[PDB]
Enzyme design. Structure first.
Site, short mmCIF file in Angstrom:
data_model
loop_
_atom_site.label_atom_id
_atom_site.label_comp_id
_atom_site.label_asym_id
_atom_site.label_seq_id
_atom_site.Cartn_x
_atom_site.Cartn_y
_atom_site.Cartn_z
N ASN A 171 -41.49 9.40 -70.16
CA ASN A 171 -41.19 8.00 -70.56
C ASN A 171 -39.72 7.75 -70.80
OD1 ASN A 171 -43.78 7.13 -70.19
ND2 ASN A 171 -44.37 7.37 -72.34
N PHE A 177 -54.44 3.38 -66.18
CA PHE A 177 -54.80 2.01 -65.81
C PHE A 177 -53.63 1.21 -65.22
CE2 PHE A 177 -58.07 2.79 -69.26
CZ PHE A 177 -59.14 2.92 -68.37
N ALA A 178 -52.58 1.91 -64.80
CA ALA A 178 -51.38 1.25 -64.28
C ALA A 178 -50.88 1.95 -63.02
CB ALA A 178 -50.29 1.24 -65.33
N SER A 199 -47.51 6.31 -62.03
CA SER A 199 -48.77 5.73 -62.40
C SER A 199 -49.26 6.24 -63.73
CB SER A 199 -49.79 6.04 -61.31
OG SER A 199 -49.86 7.44 -61.08
N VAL A 220 -47.13 1.77 -60.66
CA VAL A 220 -45.79 1.16 -60.62
C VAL A 220 -45.20 1.34 -59.25
CG1 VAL A 220 -43.50 1.00 -61.77
CG2 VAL A 220 -45.54 1.73 -63.03
N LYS A 226 -41.60 10.70 -74.94
CA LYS A 226 -41.80 11.99 -74.27
C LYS A 226 -41.05 11.93 -72.95
CE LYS A 226 -46.19 10.59 -72.26
NZ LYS A 226 -47.54 11.15 -71.87
N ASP A 270 -44.80 6.44 -77.97
CA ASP A 270 -45.13 7.27 -76.80
C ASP A 270 -43.86 7.91 -76.21
OD1 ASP A 270 -47.01 8.47 -75.06
OD2 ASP A 270 -47.16 6.72 -73.74
N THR A 300 -49.93 11.56 -76.49
CA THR A 300 -50.16 12.87 -75.88
C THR A 300 -50.03 13.96 -76.95
OG1 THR A 300 -49.30 12.12 -73.70
CG2 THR A 300 -49.28 14.49 -74.15
N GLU A 355 -37.20 -3.91 -65.07
CA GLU A 355 -35.94 -3.31 -64.59
C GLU A 355 -36.25 -1.97 -63.92
OE1 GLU A 355 -33.13 -2.41 -67.67
OE2 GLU A 355 -31.54 -1.95 -66.21
N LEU A 356 -35.70 -1.77 -62.73
CA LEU A 356 -35.90 -0.53 -61.98
C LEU A 356 -35.01 0.58 -62.52
CD1 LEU A 356 -36.93 1.10 -59.54
CD2 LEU A 356 -35.07 0.10 -58.22
N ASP A 377 -42.00 2.50 -70.71
CA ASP A 377 -43.39 2.60 -71.17
C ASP A 377 -43.66 2.11 -72.59
OD1 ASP A 377 -46.07 3.00 -71.65
OD2 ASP A 377 -46.06 5.12 -71.06
N1 LIG Z 1 -39.04 0.54 -65.00
C1 LIG Z 1 -39.44 1.63 -64.28
N2 LIG Z 1 -38.67 2.15 -63.29
C2 LIG Z 1 -39.08 3.24 -62.59
N3 LIG Z 1 -40.22 3.89 -62.81
C3 LIG Z 1 -41.09 3.46 -63.76
C4 LIG Z 1 -40.72 2.28 -64.57
N4 LIG Z 1 -41.73 2.06 -65.42
C5 LIG Z 1 -42.67 3.01 -65.20
N5 LIG Z 1 -42.26 3.85 -64.20
C6 LIG Z 1 -42.99 5.02 -63.65
O1 LIG Z 1 -44.38 4.74 -63.71
C7 LIG Z 1 -45.01 5.66 -64.63
C8 LIG Z 1 -46.13 4.96 -65.37
O2 LIG Z 1 -45.68 3.76 -65.99
P1 LIG Z 1 -45.86 3.60 -67.58
O3 LIG Z 1 -45.08 2.40 -68.03
O4 LIG Z 1 -45.49 4.94 -68.18
O5 LIG Z 1 -47.39 3.26 -67.74
P2 LIG Z 1 -48.48 4.18 -68.50
O6 LIG Z 1 -49.64 4.38 -67.53
O7 LIG Z 1 -48.75 3.35 -69.69
N6 LIG Z 1 -47.75 5.68 -69.02
P3 LIG Z 1 -48.51 7.17 -68.55
O8 LIG Z 1 -50.00 7.01 -68.73
O9 LIG Z 1 -47.91 8.13 -69.55
O10 LIG Z 1 -48.05 7.35 -67.14
C9 LIG Z 1 -43.88 6.21 -65.49
O11 LIG Z 1 -44.18 7.49 -66.08
C10 LIG Z 1 -42.74 6.26 -64.50
O12 LIG Z 1 -42.84 7.45 -63.69
MG LIG Z 2 -46.19 6.42 -69.41
#
Ligand SMILES: Nc1ncnc2c1ncn2[C@@H]1O[C@H](COP(=O)(O)OP(=O)(O)NP(=O)(O)O)[C@@H](O)[C@H]1O
Ligand SMILES: [Mg+2]
Length: 280
Positions: free
Chosen positions: A143, A23-24, A20, A26, A140, A138, A179, A93-94, A160
């Site tokens: 990501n 604002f997201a 997560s 997953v 790190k 971003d 960050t 994609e997972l 990300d």
């Molecule tokens: N394609 C994917 N497959 C598996 N895990 C994912 C995938 N995309 C995102 N995640 C997980 O979900 C987290 C958050 O998604 P992310 O795309 O990084 O959104 P974000 O909120 O913009 N980044 P952050 O705020 O740094 O967590 C990631 O840090 C991963 O742990």
């Molecule tokens: Mg992220």
């Protein structure tokens, strides 16, 4: 651009939460018609124009646009997009082997070979993106994801694209700020940004991969940012005494304040070591 407005639950079943952000969220999911698994990233929409909750439509559309362009073994890829009143839902994609962040936490300290095996893949992915004039902004360990964490040399994908931008004039000026630990001096100083910022982030990641320590990290975000802007880092003998001088040279040529003087992604692939949120 409009996205599919059918209920995503009509087409997918969701499962384990994968991660997560602010604002997201997953979630692992499975597409009913194929049995194939994906990562569904639910991004919260803004409720008004002036609101600070949620992500602006402009920002969501940029992430989607950028993701639609990319296809490379070391980048995440976009399958479908849905939306409803509250969310845009990216079917990604997972990447099932967890964050590099979590791997590094769980593992003993990396050998130089282990570090360069991860790093070469990161460099190949960033070479692809930069060839497309895409700055990730971003980069790190959280990501970067591993396909399978249980093999000797795990394969990785960059994820990300929430801060990624097309750089069609050599630089962008809308401050993007990730960050503190990983951002380049030009981000800290609110200066125009380009592909060079990613190269600094790669330098920081490399330092961490080799040592398990972070080059600029202070006790507060302001301290970290001050350290970044002053290029306040050194190679602690306790962590780096058995690290090669060429590895240090690689890092030294990335952790450069002047973005013009920093190695480019092409430079980094030819380097002898390689060549075969901001506020408290
Ligand atoms: N394609 C994917 N497959 C598996 N895990 C994912 C995938 N995309 C995102 N995640 C997980 O979900 C987290 C958050 O998604 P992310 O795309 O990084 O959104 P974000 O909120 O913009 N980044 P952050 O705020 O740094 O967590 C990631 O840090 C991963 O742990
Ligand atoms: Mg992220």
């Amino acid at each position: 651009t409009v996205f599919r407005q059918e209920n995503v639950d009509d087409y997918y079943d969701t499962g384990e939460e994968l991660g997560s952000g602010v604002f997201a969220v997953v979630k692992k999911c499975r597409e009913k018609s194929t049995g194939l698994q994906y990562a569904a990233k639910f991004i919260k929409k803004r409720r008004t124009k002036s609101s600070r909750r949620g992500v602006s439509r402009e920002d969501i559309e940029r992430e989607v646009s950028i993701l639609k362009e990319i296809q490379h073994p070391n980048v995440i890829t976009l399958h479908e997009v849905y939306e409803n009143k509250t969310d845009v839902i990216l079917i990604l994609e997972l990447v099932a082997g967890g964050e590099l962040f979590d791997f590094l936490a769980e593992k003993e300290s990396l050998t130089e070979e282990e570090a360069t095996e991860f790093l070469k893949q990161i460099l190949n992915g960033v070479y692809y993106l930069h060839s497309l004039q895409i700055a990730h902004f971003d980069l790190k360990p959280e990501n970067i994801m591993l396909l399978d964490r249980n093999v000797p040399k795990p394969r990785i994908k960059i994820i990300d694209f929430g801060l990624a931008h097309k750089i069609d004039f050599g630089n962008e000026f809308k401050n993007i700020f990730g960050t503190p630990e990983f951002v380049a001096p030009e981000i800290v100083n609110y200066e125009p940004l380009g592909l060079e910022a990613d190269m600094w982030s790669i330098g920081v990641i490399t330092y961490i991969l080799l040592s398990g320590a972070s080059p600029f990290l202070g006790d507060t975000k302001q301290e970290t940012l001050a350290n970044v802007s002053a290029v306040n880092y050194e190679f602690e003998d306790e962590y780096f005494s058995n690290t090669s001088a060429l590895a240090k040279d690689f890092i030294r040529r990335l952790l450069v304040k002047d973005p013009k003087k920093r190695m480019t992604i092409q430079d980094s692939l030819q380097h002898p070591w390689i060549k075969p949120p901001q506020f408290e």
